Design a protein around this ligand. Structure first.
Ligand code: NA
Length: 130
């Protein structure tokens, strides 16, 4: 499904993402916006290394979830990558929390560095009542 901005903001807050490991809600919103445009069914195949990015946060199969076709991969979130394509984002959120628990934190997503880091991200949550 494709979330509307404020709808997603309220959903993430309820799931406990605001300030999770120091990452503000607006940063997670900026990340979801640039990664998938708030689309839970988005997938991106990386022909260069044979891995695929899944869901709203575009989580990669080489380390985070299992899709069976990615070479030399692990599954740190202990999930089938299919779980990251559901309309209900509970599992995608639990896995995103795992990703940021790693030593790079939010920086793990290159898109965050490119479009969110050191920018005014307030706009992503304004008017949402969060
Ligand atoms: Na994997």
């Amino acid at each position: 499904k494709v979330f509307e901005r404020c709808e997603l903001a309220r959903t993430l807050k309820r799931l406990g993402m605001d300030g999770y490991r120091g990452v503000s809600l607006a940063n997670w919103m900026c990340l979801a916006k640039w990664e998938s445009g708030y689309n839970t069914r988005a997938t991106n195949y990386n022909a260069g290394d044979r891995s695929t990015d899944y869901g709203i946060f575009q989580i990669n199969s080489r380390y985070w979830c299992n899709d069976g076709k990615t070479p030399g991969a692990v599954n740190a979130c202990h999930l089938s990558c299919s779980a990251l394509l559901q309309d209900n984002i509970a599992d995608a959120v639990a896995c995103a929390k795992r990703v940021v628990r790693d030593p790079q934190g939010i920086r793990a997503w290159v898109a965050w560095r490119n479009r969110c880091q050191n920018r005014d991200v307030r706009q992503y949550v304004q008017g949402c009542g969060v």
